[PDB]
Symmetry: D3
Amino acid sequence: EKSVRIGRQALLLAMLDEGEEGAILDELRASNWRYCQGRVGAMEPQKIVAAIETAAKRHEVVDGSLYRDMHALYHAILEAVHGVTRGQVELGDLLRTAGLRFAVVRGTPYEQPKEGEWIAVALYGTIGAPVRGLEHEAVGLGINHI
Amino acid sequence: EKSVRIGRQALLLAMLDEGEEGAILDELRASNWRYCQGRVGAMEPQKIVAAIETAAKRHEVVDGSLYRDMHALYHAILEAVHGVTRGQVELGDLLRTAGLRFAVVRGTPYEQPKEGEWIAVALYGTIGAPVRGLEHEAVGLGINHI
Amino acid sequence: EKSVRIGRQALLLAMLDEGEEGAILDELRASNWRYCQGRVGAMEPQKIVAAIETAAKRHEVVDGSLYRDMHALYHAILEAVHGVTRGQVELGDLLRTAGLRFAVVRGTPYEQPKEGEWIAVALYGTIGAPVRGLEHEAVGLGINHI
Amino acid sequence: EKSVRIGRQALLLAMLDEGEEGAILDELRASNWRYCQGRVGAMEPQKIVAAIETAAKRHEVVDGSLYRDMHALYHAILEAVHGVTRGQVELGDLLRTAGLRFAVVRGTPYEQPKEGEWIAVALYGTIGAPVRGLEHEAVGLGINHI
Amino acid sequence: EKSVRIGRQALLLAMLDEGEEGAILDELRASNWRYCQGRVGAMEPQKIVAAIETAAKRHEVVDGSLYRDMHALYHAILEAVHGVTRGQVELGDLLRTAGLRFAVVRGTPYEQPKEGEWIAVALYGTIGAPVRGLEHEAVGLGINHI
Amino acid sequence: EKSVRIGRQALLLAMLDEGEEGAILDELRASNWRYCQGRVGAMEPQKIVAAIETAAKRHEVVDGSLYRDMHALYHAILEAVHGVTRGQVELGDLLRTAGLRFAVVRGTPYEQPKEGEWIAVALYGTIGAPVRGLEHEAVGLGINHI
Ligand SMILES: N[C@@H](Cc1c[nH]c[nH+]1)C(=O)O
Ligand SMILES: N[C@@H](Cc1c[nH]c[nH+]1)C(=O)O
Ligand SMILES: N[C@@H](Cc1c[nH]c[nH+]1)C(=O)O
Ligand SMILES: N[C@@H](Cc1c[nH]c[nH+]1)C(=O)O
Ligand SMILES: N[C@@H](Cc1c[nH]c[nH+]1)C(=O)O
Ligand SMILES: N[C@@H](Cc1c[nH]c[nH+]1)C(=O)O
Ligand SMILES: [Mg+2]
Ligand SMILES: [Mg+2]
Ligand SMILES: [Mg+2]
Ligand SMILES: [Mg+2]
Ligand SMILES: [Mg+2]
Ligand SMILES: [Mg+2]
Ligand SMILES: [Mg+2]
Ligand SMILES: [Mg+2]
Ligand SMILES: [Mg+2]
Ligand SMILES: [Mg+2]
């Protein structure tokens, strides 16, 4: 009964370049956890939330018709987005835009089997002015029971 | 095209297990950037801030007597801590505690040399109740010009 | 010189089903306090604020032309809406919508007659995804002197 | 149609005077849901959180050794406390104190059985200066899946 | 047209050097408004709030035994303090300290007499690390009806 | 090596009537600091941010093409706007609008020449309902190294 850093897995999927994330994809392949990865460019924060919801449903990480799944996920997304905005969640209303990669991981990270499933949402990318090149990095992670 | 993800380097230092970080430590040597790593266990947020300020100074990443350096670092730390707390920056006052790794990296990551120096502060850890095992992961990143 | 739970009156008007709130309507009828009740469905928070302002003016709880009345009320509304959003006041920008009942009560709740008038704004309903059934409950209360 | 307003039950327990709550206590018996009530006087927010965690555990509403239960409850408590503080969760640090009743209710309130269990935490009280009589009402509600 | 910028008067009292404020002190005499000034050094925010409450009472700007007066003043103080902290109201808990001047002015600044009395609270100072010289300026203003 | 209250200079430019700010304009003329003044009426906060950015670039206080300058300024603007909104930065989404004067000052306020440049953003005006006359005053100040 080993414990796993599910959040760090999600983050690595969001921040490692393609073909560097091989070992993560294999760990998740082994323990048979559901996950998805995606990208979103946004000036409205709801577009982030919807992108992640669209991806998680699409790759069967969560069931769009089951509120407990969607409630779990929604709260994780909002925690992740707070990491990126480092305060109030605003993009366009504060004249900034973000370009982000995301990952979502659903699994059983705890040693005790009774801890059940947990979900992780990671974000990594840039935030900046609406003009290319006037930006820096940002990150977030959200965790919730599911 | 010559730009570097300084934040991702800092986050990788904070999150990769000791002994997995060699290629990040090598890149930093080649560019001759200053950096440091550390760990802090805290039930009060000022202990995080003091720990990272203490580390950065003692490793000569910043000059503790120069306000522009300490001003730049302080704001980057608060940004990183927001990512960890996902809302109001509180630990003990909301009955939670954190165990965090951190890293600080300063160099010049943009192509244009006029962009000068920037500093990244990354936190990766757990947060939870003050009871062993009742915790989950958290992450944060702050960036500032310096 | 009895004291009255004006906030709890407002809340009961917002959360009790119709025909259950009889005794509240009679207490308010007795002490001759002004009040109003209403409903709003919204994806933009300003639509909540405007609905409540429209109702309070309409039922003569406040004077639309007197800023001290409208300043009193506005601040109470925003406190109530914070209860509902449990953090940043966002609906649509965070991909959620709310369906709420409200009540506003204006009166003299304190024992001392010199405490003058006070106003209460209560909200109760659901918040959720923009899709019906994927929602749970929410509440708020705001109090201010007037 | 079979759904229940679990939050409204919790709020009614918290706010109705002792002896007025019988029909709420009866509904809860018929559905066989777990629940508890309590009171806390506090000048620090962690005392609220500790009080409700202590109560829920000691009445077997949650399992203090199971993180998914304590994780679900903790987030519901912070949501309820936001409603009380109407902004930053502070008491003593902003020179205020609170006297609150609380209730926690867990059962399954949705029609579809797959929605499983949810927990409500409700706070109703006063908040004010640390001087007798310089206070007004406050309320909060938090809901989470569990 | 007869309106007065009561907040600007309060801010000018707080920020102008002693001996530069005479014309503001004169305007206040002519209108016979109540007011007070003061200084507070603090590492905890409640010390600000207590200091301004203490000053207002002891100079008879407000009646410490009347809740409507203390309620009006308290909210104006928290607003002013938000301007100083530029986010979460924290000093010591985020490893910073402040040295502030304040002023409180109450009179009736609107044209229409029905608008009655209003109170302004202004803070002007520095905030910084608890080390001499590692600081910069900050300001705040709060207004409320009273 | 004298120290200068650069923030208080910016604030005075934002709050003093025209022809009253003479001595400030002369001090800045003497030390040869860059600055600009402006006005903005807005119901969307990004319109404030853009107005100030447009003015600062236009009067050569900052270089629009240099991210370190624009990053410095952006953060100062957001600190200033927090002073005005006294919490969450919202105007129209919370059914309020603002009419503001601003000033931006860039200079070398510290005694030590190694402290380099710093920038100040001040705001002063009114915030209120979208209807004229139902408003009161607001202020903010942001400081950052540059
Ligand atoms: N630096 C901002 C983003 C930005 C807006 N404009 C320029 N940069 C941030 O930390 O989010
Ligand atoms: N889950 C909390 C931490 C915690 C407090 N108590 C139990 N857990 C968080 O997300 O920060
Ligand atoms: N559960 C969210 C609302 C929601 C959005 N999407 C799904 N649910 C809240 O607490 O406000
Ligand atoms: N009125 C404050 C409580 C308070 C503090 N001091 C006086 N009253 C609030 O709304 O939370
Ligand atoms: N610069 C901080 C104050 C500070 C803390 N440590 C150093 N400086 C602020 O803007 O509030
Ligand atoms: N009084 C509000 C502004 C307002 C909105 N509506 C009426 N007034 C504030 O402090 O920001
Ligand atoms: Mg929810
Ligand atoms: Mg600063
Ligand atoms: Mg605090
Ligand atoms: Mg504290
Ligand atoms: Mg106001
Ligand atoms: Mg918004
Ligand atoms: Mg918006
Ligand atoms: Mg959690
Ligand atoms: Mg109050
Ligand atoms: Mg930035």
